[model samples]
Target: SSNFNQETVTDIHHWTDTLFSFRTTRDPGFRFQSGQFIMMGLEVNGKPLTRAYSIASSLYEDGLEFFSIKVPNGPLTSKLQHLKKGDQIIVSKKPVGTLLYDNLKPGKHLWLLSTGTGLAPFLSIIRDLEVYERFEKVILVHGVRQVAELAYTDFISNELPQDEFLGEMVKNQLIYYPTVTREPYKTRGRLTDLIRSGQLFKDVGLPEFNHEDDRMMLCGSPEMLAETKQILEERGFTEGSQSEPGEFVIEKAFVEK
Candidate 1:
């Protein structure tokens, strides 16, 4: 219900034609959870159109970072793909999402399962030193169509060890499991395949996921989330929420394909 006329693109980093990361002018009065999503768009056809994008940069960071995918024919992204630094953009004052830690209690291991742009929120959550403070280990499982598309993840990979805080608590504790769906990689296929086949445990050198000890978060396309949720359920993991904490939670990212 609020209007955002003050948003501006301060910086942009293009990873590929379909993937990019951009920084926006922060709303000094606006605040949100590190992993929350915000409404954003341009005023097109005399009316405003908006889509929810998860905030990538941790709240502790001075600025806001957003990782986005270009949907070839998407009404918003078609135009959004060309935005340049200093361009005027609109971000609603209100940000909302289910990716916050409130949805799950503290645990020994935090499993973040994502695909493509779904990795956005985890990018935010992992950067927060609080994550390491709360959990002993953090495992990020990302599935993408190709290796080139995983470029944005380098942001966290590069930053984690530099911090004295994250360096000690999360350095040796953090693990990245990048799976390729259509492209060939050291780990290929959906994570469901990896989980059902026991390959994930072997490749990551972690024990099999047990609801008694692990907390998991899933974000991806609807189909991927549903499939992964079923896999978790079959293993006795229950769906959790901001109100009722449980073993697993899920969020959906804007899909391009």
Candidate 2:
């Protein structure tokens, strides 16, 4: 389709049997905000098959990056999982999403909440140096079923801090909180339970949510988003959009329906 860009795959990394990430060539004019998602996939049966995928790479990177699920029986991912370097894929130039800096009002602390593949958008946000300037502190909280699903552990924990431009901010302003729901880990339990029990705040050494100084972005399953939104609303937080900035914003990690 004319709306999509043909890009060659540059790199691929398999994080787990179910999850993988790949880098692809970027069109010069295909600019996007850090936390946006684009349509991506391959052509099959003389027709294009595309799915929405969040851009995992920072805007500073020369190429596009995407984290994906290898749904064994699904339509697109079943084929997407087999892609390797030098292969060509379809990437739509148009990127749109609400999980952006401009969607939230300025605040002292930024809380990024995610589950499963929802971490994709947050990865882009944290990697971008601009987020550091938007808030005093940025906390990334990711939850998955098992520890192995914690993709980019090395990059976020070690590599990001060593980058020349983002080093200091990543070292000082970024706090990573990863939890596992089905396995034993440093932190266990769903984010909703953690927040409700006040353990999340205590562990992070931060106060409970306050509309005054805390801005949040949520990405996950519909159930997770709905429950999280209820908690935020109970605490006086309002949802935000690209046109109407507010205290919190949300996007589905994947559109299942």
Candidate 3:
């Protein structure tokens, strides 16, 4: 990509108090696998500060979309959020991350465990038919602190129905499981707590994750990721990556602030 270092901000949409979605002007040769993370930022004092953000828009889409959490006092996002449409940003030459779907073992169930903005990557995966082609059932469990932070989740619920491609995926195979940690809602608690307590399976109306036939992809804060990984390990699931395929995989969202 000749212009790999030069990407324009095409659009920016705020989803919630801390969440936002933005699209960058495309480079003809810029390509990446679904769930890949790209390093992007601006020049700071003649030096560049970039962070990895999972590509939220599916590869099937035209422009690239990324969902982010604006962290107050954070280095990149603080300035990144200030960018508007038609602005210029920097995108690195390569994308990196182990969150790609290819790392998941061929299975009947794909369980995506996300907390806060961690749901961003899975949003891209679920919107793509490649997920269904690899698994029979795709369960996305998104956890947030408050009901208001569930904007992207709600959008997925409504958008999928209207999407001709993903509409059928939802009808026959997809399931959305949302949990609110600090709010009064139909479901409450972290995903790990819910999974261990059996509330998650009950609410999703799906069987407990089986290591033999189901694969899980996890993303969250380090503590949460470790805790969830422990729970999955207890269930006989193993970790995986792009180079090493296994029963499950994981990637933490970029931390700032």
**Who wins the lDDT comparison?**
2
RMSD of each: 2.0, 1.0, 2.0
Q: Which stretches of candidate 1 lie over 4 Å from their true place?
A: 255-257
Clashing pairs in 1: none
Tens-digit lDDT track of model 1 for 50-125: 8888988777776777889887899888999999988877777888887767788767888999988888898888
lDDT (Cα atoms) of all candidates against the true structure = 0.81, 0.91, 0.80
lDDT of 3: 0.80
Tens-digit lDDT string for candidate 3 (1-257): 33347777888988775788898876777777767778877877767787888878777776777788888888888998888888877777788778767787788888888887788788788878888888888898888889888857667777786787778877678888888989898888988898789988888777877767788888878878989888888877788876789988888875433
Candidate 1 TM-score, C-alpha based: 0.92
Q: How far is candidate 2 from the true structure (C-alpha RMSD, Å)?
A: 1.0
Model 3 TM-score (2 dp): 0.93
The C-alpha TM-scores of every prediction are: 0.92, 0.97, 0.93
**Runs of candidate 3 exceeding 4 Å displacement:** 1-3, 255-257
Q: Write the per-residue lDDT of candidate 2 for residues 57-152, one digit (tens) a residue.
A: 889889988989889998998999999899989988889999998999999999999998898998899989889998888999998999999998
Candidate ranking under lDDT, highest first, comes to: 2, 1, 3
